[PDB]
Write a structure and sequence with these properties.
Length: 173
Amino acid sequence: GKITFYEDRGFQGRHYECSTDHSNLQPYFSRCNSVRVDSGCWMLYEQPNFTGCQYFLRRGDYPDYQQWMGFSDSVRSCRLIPHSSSHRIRIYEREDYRGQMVEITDDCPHLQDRFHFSDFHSFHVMEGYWVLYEMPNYRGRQYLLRPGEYRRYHDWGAMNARVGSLRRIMDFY
């Protein structure tokens, strides 16, 4: 993977080329108003140590932070997401894997409209990397889900339970 951060919009200003996870990008730039993703799938984080708001980016040009649904020009840590050949997640109605459940291996642009139940409070990521979104059609707050267990919203870094859609992380072409 290769990503380049720019302090000003339109790919201007101080820039930093990156090919690895970073817990602290502050030594290299103080703001990020545009990004070029040469390759790979990336999760950017507003704050150091993979905290704060999260944003999913993949190959392509992002001339303004709004293009990655940024809440501001803050980017202070990043993960390069590794390759997934398969994706599998269990979605549960209540916290701690209780209530109704469905197991999917594809994307879901509208949780509410698609299943046999209407509330979504815990997740077990069996295979692959996913982005969980606050709103339908992959909008709003974004949260990376890695393989493993999410018993309640705090486990995925949300300040509340609001969710709307789910996307597998796969690259483009």
